[PDB]
Amino acid sequence: NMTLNFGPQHPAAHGVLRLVLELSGEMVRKCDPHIGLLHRGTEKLIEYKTYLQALPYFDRLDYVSMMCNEQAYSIAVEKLLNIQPPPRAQWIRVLFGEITRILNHIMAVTTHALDIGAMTPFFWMFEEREKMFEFYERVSGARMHAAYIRPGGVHQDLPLGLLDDIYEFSKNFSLRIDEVEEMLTNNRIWRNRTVDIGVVTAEDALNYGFSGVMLRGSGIQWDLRKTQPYDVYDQVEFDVPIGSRGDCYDRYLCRVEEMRQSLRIIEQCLNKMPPGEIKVDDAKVSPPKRAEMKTSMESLIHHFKLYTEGYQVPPGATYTAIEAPKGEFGVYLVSDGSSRPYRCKIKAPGFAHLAGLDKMSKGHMLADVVAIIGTQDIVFGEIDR
């Protein structure tokens, strides 16, 4: 088992992973993943920043699912304040929440293939991704790292015309997923490198805290979006894609199926989004509209205090978890009465998944390790935080 220190060789990437390994020839005896190559301090930095100026950190925690992460902090800060977002904002967050899930799955399925060696699916779907980014940009201003979902709702209403385009795209994206399929779902070769690789039992998946497709792929039925509804994911109707014979191929099929189910949720959101405001009306939590702060004294005072000092969340602590595309993303946000948080442990679906690499890739070849890092959608930002 000559340690090879593989992974600083940019072989599965997804970030920078020094997967020190001991391999008797081409068989892996033990995988000890090393982490922290991307630790940056996100958890300590937040303690020194106000709630609204810590929102941009969450987009960077796992930036392939830029927004879905923001929703988790939002929800958490809203709970602590016992404020809820307005009805239109909720639908928006579910609209962009799902668009983001697609974006993550297009990343996970196509990047999985690039490591496997199939390169054309990535270019096919990165063009669709591109088109989605443009939604982000025309809603937030940034292609990724938007900062659109803030603790009290969305920042600004959708541009006048976005919904129509999030339709044209959705109306077609399916065929794009269909194509990838005709290239990989039944490839006589995709199956081999993926089938029966990294099988994880159901009991073991719950035990190692997998909590994601990784659980769903093993047949455990748990979607925090159906079990513990957040926002208005309760008002929509979608089917969790549960899997059997959990293995790299089965979970994949699950990720392609949630891409499909998210188009079902996006359709609805476009069909039923309400007229209304996109941010709470409590100037206490949400910043006042710029026409108001420039004509009304109470609004300037509320604008000045909110931007300079902060929300001033009531003292308490909460663990709120959503179903980020990777898995359960949760923020444990302890908070003193101050405007700046006290602690904000980010639970990363990924710290648990990597740990499982050892119990998944046993008696496996070097190529198998590459396939399994792909089937965990490891974004080193969330793991390293």
């Binding site: 630790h39 300590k44 106000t50 809820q84 719950l206 308490g316 949760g330 602690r343």
Partner: protein
């Protein structure tokens, strides 16, 4: 104003009593937040016993460990507040069991109860310095290989004490005491006026 259902604050409250009764040797306080979240508090010795009862009890199956974290209240004699958040896919409820550990009074490890904790416990040692007995392999996970000091402790400087640059003379990366070119501006933000009785 958020919608609150008291069904949960009642269900969870009752469970709290149930846990407390079943594990009275360790449960010190059991509270339900106004946010409908239970937070049994246990003596550090009850780490193994309280978790195991929750992982393997028919009326309370709490199979997966959502997270293991340690807030650091420097004022508190026992500095760290290890918090374990658990989920029950069977009863669709989460509970949090939180204990207290000082810097040199280690806590037991639950890698036995949940193997998810193998990594998070290493994370708590690296950042806060709490030690976990009976851990299979406790070693720094997130910090650099030669890092000295536990970073998330409230008493550790944000910028830290060492930074890295490449030195030609020695043709190798080299630590030097941190010298920052614009110190972190420490805006004082607390207002001198309170908000409510709380």
């Amino acid at each position: 104003v958020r919608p609150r259902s008291d069904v949960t604050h009642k269900q969870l409250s009752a469970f709290g009593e149930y846990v407390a009764e079943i594990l009275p040797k360790y449960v010190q306080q059991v509270q339900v937040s106004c946010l409908d979240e239970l937070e049994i508090c246990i003596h550090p010795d009850g780490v193994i016993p309280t978790l195991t009862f929750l992982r393997d009890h028919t009326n309370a199956q709490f199979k997966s460990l959502a997270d293991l974290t340690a807030v650091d209240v420097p004022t508190r004699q026992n500095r760290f507040e290890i918090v374990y958040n658990l989920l029950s896919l069977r009863f669709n409820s989460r509970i949090r069991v939180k204990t207290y550990a000082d810097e040199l009074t280690p806590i037991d490890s639950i890698v036995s109860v949940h193997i998810a904790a193998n990594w998070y416990e290493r994370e708590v040692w690296d950042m806060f310095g709490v030690f976990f007995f009976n851990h299979p392999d406790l070693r720094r996970i997130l910090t650099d290989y030669g890092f000295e000091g536990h970073p998330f402790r409230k008493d550790f400087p944000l910028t830290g004490y060492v930074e890295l640059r490449y030195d030609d003379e020695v043709k190798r990366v080299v630590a030097e005491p941190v010298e920052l070119a614009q110190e972190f501006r420490k805006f004082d933000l607390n207002s001198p006026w309170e908000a409510f009785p709380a």
